[PDB]
Design a binder for this molecule. Sequence first.
Ligand SMILES: O=C(O)c1cc2cc(Br)ccc2o1
Length: 274
Amino acid sequence: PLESQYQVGPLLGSGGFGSVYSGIRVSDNLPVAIKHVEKDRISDWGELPNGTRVPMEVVLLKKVSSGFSGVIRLLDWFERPDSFVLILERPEPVQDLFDFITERGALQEELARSFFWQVLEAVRHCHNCGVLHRDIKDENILIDLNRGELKLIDFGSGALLKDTVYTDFDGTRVYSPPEWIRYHRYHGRSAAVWSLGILLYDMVCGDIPFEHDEEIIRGQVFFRQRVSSECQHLIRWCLALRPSDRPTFEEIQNHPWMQDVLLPQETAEIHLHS
Ligand SMILES: O=C(O)c1cc2cc(Br)ccc2o1
C-alpha cells in the first residue's frame, strides 16, 4: 500500500471534481495525475465486482479501462479516512481542449472534424462499456499533443447507462438539454448527443452557443463565425429540441461533414506542430 509509490508534483487544477496533481510513479517514472476526491462530496456510491463501497466514479472508470486510448485510464486508487485518491494516466505534453480553444480561437473545420470524430469514438466506448459520462465538454477532454489523440476524462458526474429516464443530473448546465432544463427528465443517449452539438459548436465558433436557460429551451442557433453549411446542419441536428429528432452516433458519423477524417498522427503533424 501507500505513498512511497508516487512523487507528487504541481497542483494542476481543482473544482467541483476535487484537486488534481501532476505526479510520477516512482517505480518506472510513468507520468500520472493524482486526483483527490472528498468523501463528503461524493453523493453517488457504488460497489465493485468485489463488494467494497467506492465512489461511482471509480466503478465507471474501471468499466471503461482498456488500452483504447480515447478514454482516460484509472491505474490505481486508494482509500483514506476522508477521501479517495485516484491515480490516472497523464499524457505529456498535454493540454485540455478548453485551454487549446482559449489559445487558438475557433478551430479550422478539418481540425474540429478530427477532434469531434475522436470524441464520438470515445463516447461510443463509454456507452459500449455500460457508462454514461453526462459531462462531455471541452474542459473534460485532454489532447495528447505528440500523438494528436484526445482522451475523455472526469467521470465524477457519470452513471451506469440505462434505457429508462434519468431524473438527477450534476454535470454542466450550459451543456445540458432543454428537457432537463424544463422537466428535470432526460434519456442518456439523446442528452449525450445534445452535449456533443454544444461541443462541436464550441470548437467551430470558439465559445458555446447558449449561456442562459432561456436560450437552451428556445434552441435557436446563431453562428457567430463562418461555418460550412454541412457543419451547421450537423450541429442544428444534434441540437434538435425534441430528443427523438437528434441523430444517433451512427447518423452523426455517417454525416457528410464527418467524411475523410484525418488520422490522429496526421492531425498532430498538420495542426499541433509535430
Ligand atoms: O478527473 C479526471 O478524470 C482527470 C483529470 C485529469 C488531468 C490529467 Br493531466 C490527466 C488525467 C486526468 O483525469
